[PDB]
């Protein structure tokens, strides 16, 4: 198989799993039927990441940055806006062609482009090449395997290494070699005195939660934790589990647990003991 996370998110949203008025402006809705455990897995993934982000936002009082590496058609910028939880600046990185596609959608959809300009210092946006830079939001076409390019393009969109900064790689690191991803993680740690990293990945051949923790600790992070997605699903608020479990009928074969045990959410911090960053959990 090979899956597009943003199509699957659009699908789960359509059934009611979580609130996202924005994703429909990026991608079409499939009319297939899906095994509902897939939707539950997506809900757990998005809820886990989101609880971690909001924890970070709370500790930093939003005086911070978020850099989402390999963001795709993520809608989180627009969701945080609506919740009044925006960071000082929000950055996205993806391949240039993935970025062009995202920019074309923002250009064609005032429900996407109005909020960006509202928070912008001008009434117009320059969408030259494969970058959109504005006051609170930037989408940057770059290759995550070229760390010096990555850093140059970020800094020229006003990424400030003095601000606490949260970086997210949500199903991205698998697309690069272990050396390349280790180098990304290391760069991320080296560039900020105060920082958090969130990594959501499949637990492949040979990997384990402990190797996931060590992958971060050995690349310059000072704290790390990791849970498999079934532990996380099991720890979801009972009101949310109740809400999402009555959306679709699930048969009696306990295949949710088969699916989720192969995914993990890991997060690490560096500095900001003053901020209580090492205390953040999902
Ligand atoms: C599996 S998708 C996940 C998208 C998004 N984070 C989500 O979870 O909905 C991975 C994304 O990583 C991007 N990606 C993979 N390797 C990359 C690279 N070397 N440089 C820039 N982006 C990359 C892909 O283009 C794709 O948009
Ligand atoms: Na490209």
UniProtKB/Swiss-Prot annotation:
One annotated GO biological process: protein methylation
Catalytic activity: [phosphatase 2A protein]-C-terminal L-leucine + S-adenosyl-L-methionine = [phosphatase 2A protein]-C-terminal L-leucine methyl ester + S-adenosyl-L-homocysteine
Class of enzymatic activity (EC top level): transferase
Keyword Transferase found: yes
Stated role: Methylates the carboxyl group of the C-terminal leucine residue of protein phosphatase 2A catalytic subunits to form alpha-leucine ester residues.
The family this protein is said to belong to: Belongs to the methyltransferase superfamily. LCMT family.
Name assigned to this protein: Leucine carboxyl methyltransferase 1
Organism listed in the record: Homo sapiens (Human)
Name of the encoding gene: LCMT1
């Amino acid at each position: 198989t090979c899956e597009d996370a943003s199509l699957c998110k659009r699908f789960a949203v359509s059934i009611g799993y979580w609130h996202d008025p924005y994703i429909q402006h990026f991608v079409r809705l499939s009319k297939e039927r899906k095994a509902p455990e897939i939707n539950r897995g997506y809900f757990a993934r998005v809820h886990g990441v989101s609880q971690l982000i909001k924890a970070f936002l709370r500790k930093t009082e939003c005086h911070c940055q978020i850099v989402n590496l390999g963001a795709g058609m993520d809608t989180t910028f627009w969701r945080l806006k609506d919740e009044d939880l925006l960071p000082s600046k929000y950055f996205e990185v993806d391949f240039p062609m993935i970025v062009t596609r995202k920019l074309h959608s923002i250009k064609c959809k005032p429900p996407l482009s109005s909020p960006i300009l509202e928070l912008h210092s001008e009434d117009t946006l320059q969408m030259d090449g494969h970058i959109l830079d504005s006051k609170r939001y930037a989408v940057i076409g770059a290759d995550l395997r070229d760390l010096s390019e990555l850093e140059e393009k970020l800094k020229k969109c006003n990424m400030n290494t003095q601000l606490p900064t949260l970086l997210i790689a949500e199903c991205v690191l698998v697309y690069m070699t272990p050396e390349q991803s280790a180098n990304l993680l290391k760069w991320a740690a080296n560039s900020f005195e105060r920082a958090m990293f969130i990594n959501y990945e499949q637990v492949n051949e040979g990997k384990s939660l402990e190797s996931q923790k060590e992958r971060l600790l050995s690349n310059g992070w000072e704290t790390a934790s990791a849970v498999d997605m079934m532990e996380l699903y099991n720890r979801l608020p009972r009101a949310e589990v109740s809400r999402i479990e009555s959306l679709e009928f699930l048969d009696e074969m306990e295949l949710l647990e088969q699916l989720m045990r192969h995914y993990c959410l890991c997060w690490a911090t560096k500095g900001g003991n003053e901020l209580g960053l090492k205390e953040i959990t999902y």
